[PDB]
Design a protein around this nucleic acid. Sequence first.
RNA 1: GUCUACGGCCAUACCACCCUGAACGCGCCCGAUCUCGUCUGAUCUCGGAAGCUAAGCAGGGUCGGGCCUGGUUAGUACUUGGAUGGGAGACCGCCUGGGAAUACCGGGUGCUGUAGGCUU
RNA 2: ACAGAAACCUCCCGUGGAGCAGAAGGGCAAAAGCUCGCUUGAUCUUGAUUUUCAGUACGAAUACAGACCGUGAAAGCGGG
RNA 3: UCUUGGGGCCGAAACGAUCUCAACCUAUUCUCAAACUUUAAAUGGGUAAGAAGCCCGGCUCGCUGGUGUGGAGCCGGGCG
Lengths: 293, 205, 50, 159, 170
Amino acid sequence: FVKVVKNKAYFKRYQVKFRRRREGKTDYYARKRLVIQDKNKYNTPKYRMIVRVTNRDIICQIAYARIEGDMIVCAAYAHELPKYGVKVGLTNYAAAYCTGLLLARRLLNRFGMDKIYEGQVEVTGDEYNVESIDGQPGAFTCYLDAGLARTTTGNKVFGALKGAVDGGLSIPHSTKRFPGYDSESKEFNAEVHRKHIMGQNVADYMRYLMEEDEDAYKKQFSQYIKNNVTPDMMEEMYKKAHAAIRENPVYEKKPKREVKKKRWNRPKMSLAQKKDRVAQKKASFLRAQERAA
Amino acid sequence: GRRPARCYRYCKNKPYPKSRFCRGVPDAKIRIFDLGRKKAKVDEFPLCGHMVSDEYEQLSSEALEAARICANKYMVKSCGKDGFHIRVRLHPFHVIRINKMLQTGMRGAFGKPQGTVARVHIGQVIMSIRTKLQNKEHVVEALRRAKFKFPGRQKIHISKKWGFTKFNADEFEDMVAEKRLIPDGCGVKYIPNRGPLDKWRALHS
Amino acid sequence: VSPKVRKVLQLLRLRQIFNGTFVKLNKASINMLRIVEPYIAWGYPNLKSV
Amino acid sequence: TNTKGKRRGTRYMFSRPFRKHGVVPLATYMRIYKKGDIVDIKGMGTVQKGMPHKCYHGKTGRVYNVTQHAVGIVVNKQVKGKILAKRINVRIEHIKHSKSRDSFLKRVKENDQKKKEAKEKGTWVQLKRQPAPPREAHFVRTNGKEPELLEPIPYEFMA
Amino acid sequence: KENPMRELRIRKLCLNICVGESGDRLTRAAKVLEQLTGQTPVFSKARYTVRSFGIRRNEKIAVHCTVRGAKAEEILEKGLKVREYELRKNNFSDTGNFGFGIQEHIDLGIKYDPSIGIYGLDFYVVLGRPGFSIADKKRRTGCIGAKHRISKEEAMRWFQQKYDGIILPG
RNA sequence: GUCUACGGCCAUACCACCCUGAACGCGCCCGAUCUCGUCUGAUCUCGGAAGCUAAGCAGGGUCGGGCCUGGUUAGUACUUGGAUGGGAGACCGCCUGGGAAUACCGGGUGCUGUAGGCUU
RNA sequence: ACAGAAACCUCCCGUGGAGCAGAAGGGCAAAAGCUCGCUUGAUCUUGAUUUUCAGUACGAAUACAGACCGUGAAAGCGGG
RNA sequence: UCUUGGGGCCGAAACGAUCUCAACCUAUUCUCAAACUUUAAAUGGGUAAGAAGCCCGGCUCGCUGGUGUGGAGCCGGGCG
Ligand SMILES: [Mg+2]
Ligand SMILES: [Mg+2]
Ligand SMILES: [Mg+2]
Ligand SMILES: [Mg+2]
Ligand SMILES: [Mg+2]
Ligand SMILES: [Mg+2]
Ligand SMILES: [Mg+2]
Ligand SMILES: [Mg+2]
Ligand SMILES: [Mg+2]
Ligand SMILES: [Mg+2]
Ligand SMILES: [Mg+2]
């Protein structure tokens, strides 16, 4: 027999990590450097672009930190994209670009800078940085908050970053992590990046499956077929998505409806209930003991 | 060999245990703190008499060893080698030093370890004897003799607890009836109304 | 006289033996009188004493 | 004699409290310190940069300078028979806004409002604080019961 | 009816050959694993120096590799055939895994080669159910849960059903 | 009622086991052409949507351990100031104020900010 | 499998009970530890401050400011 | 208590049986720390208790900046 390590003393001495760290959601080493503002800038907010890719969505937010909790300034979601013509593939690189662009256009519309800072209305996929215009309100500057993502080349967080810079936001970055950057030659190809932004990597995959295996094709792209999304029309679908996104980036909140009260889980038992339950258990145990005797 | 115990009777210095900073301490004179029928169950010996210190002082491990023998011999002679259980309740942890002369004088005068002593307080128990109730007079006489091996004033006091347990003698038996006390050999375990109800089942099954 | 008692006796204006003053009582002053307790006789005077 | 070492004697002073080690909560860096603020200095061992010297632990000062990470504090230090005003540079991890002036500031506002509210009403209100007065006369009702007689208990040798 | 997401599967097959000494033998051993599996193995270095074993720290003394998916089952069949699908109850770890050893690698259907020699190796089969990867991911890593774990009995039962094997007492 | 993204305080939130989870989610999950990275598409990256709450996750449970908070311990131990108080001393008592901590007993078991959902 | 108390492989628990050049003390868990990759902020420069203190020097150290760089996707971090 | 050893002890002999004493683990229990500690006093050490304050309106900036933002400075004014 060996010592119980997780004994009573192991818990008397135990210190728990920050809740968000226990949950595995926040990197507090990274958060401190991202969100903390220089003390000589006082209350000047330090904005950052949050990009989180779930199993079925892309969440893009513009937040600055306060003592009580972050204040989300603007937010766009990939599940909004159907309003703009994109029905499927809401977690690919092209959707990330659309989600990011919608975030930038939505934010600039709010501050009234959309006309001033239109960004790169024509997607070339190349290094582009917006510059403030003298005599006009400065360009909105934020930073990318990649979370726990492994920020390698082609990571979709940089697709959303590319959408936001092309939307008019000022976000420091390089092209090293856009798809099309070649490590061997240390050279960046803007056409390869433009392919991913338009999803030609997805479309080229479709033709591959179609010309290689019909059954594997149906398995991999069943919902593309259902929505009548074909490899030829993909680029114009996304192009029609950008133009509509720039045309109207405003969000209209889903109208909140009253709901009849309904409790879907138990409440805590009261002290009387818990105390009685032990009383019932004790009587039942003795009652069963007396019978067997 | 060793100095008269009057040289170290008073708790003048801070506690000086045998540790990694005090190396070379010789072994203590007292190595056995229990004797008699240590294995008696809690219920065989309801009586407990203490020798209580009236003085704040240091007792030497030689006096603890001497008293242990003195008290034990009289108990064996009057109650049998299995009619009692003695427990010396003081352990000699404080170390006393000696600055051995024959010359440097008082230069570099920090002393080497010389022995060990137990630091006892007013009201602290020095040793205890539990035996049967018809040995109340024998316990008092056993402890009265042991006092002559110690410096200062002690008092013999018959406890109201049950043997070496912390529970009052008059209410010990009922607590055992209600299974609030479960004998565990020399002493008892205390059963609170807490924790998994399964334990309560095992006790009450 | 100790430094703290010596200051408090000077604030009460009792710089000499058998010197007398009236003191209106409250938490602030009652705690001062506690400091100089071994150095003063005090109590509640009546109209005749005033 | 003793060494003149900078961090001598701070075994417990600069250590972290029990079960409060690890990450530094980020609201420690979200505090806004302005020129003229009152701050309590408390060295934190987790951050070894900008650590105030041990003589400044538990002293309160006035902020006179603010930089990217630290502030300049004017804090009184007594050295023999004089008190010096010392200007130290301390990273904002080791300080915290003092609450001492708040009870004053809270009073300043309530006074000015009372002084303005009573003025328009042509009355008079108390603004100055006062030490606790001796408790006024009052009746104590026995409620038809006799006070419990108390006696000293016999000595009993509980050894 | 058992939930489909509770069924057992072979997470990975761990093949190891502790040659015991760097040099020509160890390099040959790496080749044998490459033949059996089809992927380059990776050496492992001695953690310490043990005079009796004749190993010095940071010295390559073993070669191992991980085989998963369809290839893992095919090679597992080879080894269990060599054992006649007979294992001992002790061969099953309390965590739901099991393993066995092979004396000569030629018995696994590998043609002998004069330039390589013969070698033994270890087979350790790590079992799992769907969802076992929540503990190996980066974001929101968690523990699978008591009801989702695999027991010595369950693995022994799986071995019998999957291969009709025999679990020898002792 | 409750979830998701980002949080503040950082166990009342942890740990162990058990029960239950509507909808949207979050996941598990299916693949490796592309981006990317591995001995291994297990992880990381990427493309998906057949299946499932089994697990994570959420809520509830346990005369649960821990944690938090009270009571008792106790006006006790300790302590500021006082005496030409006691005692051979060791120490102790009183006067004037302050005043703890175990064992033991009870109760509680996350709150909450911004943005976005689901829930007649 | 050879393989043993001890070689290498696997799973599980693991609040640090390891490690961080050295004395000890403090500090540290997606790090301050281990491993890779790129590197020379261990560079150039004026002041202020802290520590011992006489509020002198040295030494060491702390916030800044001006350049030139490294690194990172970036926020930042780095003048041992 | 077999997860290891000492004595035996039926034996054909094995982790078969039989015990037994050790170590091991589990709750207990006596006694301790100047160079231990979850707790934690008294006495004590800073600070604040207004006119150098409080509240208004405006101007300057090369500093910071989505923002006529932020911060600092300056100017006039009202409050005892
Ligand atoms: Mg990072
Ligand atoms: Mg003599
Ligand atoms: Mg001395
Ligand atoms: Mg469980
Ligand atoms: Mg459902
Ligand atoms: Mg896979
Ligand atoms: Mg379930
Ligand atoms: Mg409990
Ligand atoms: Mg909750
Ligand atoms: Mg790191
Ligand atoms: Mg610089």
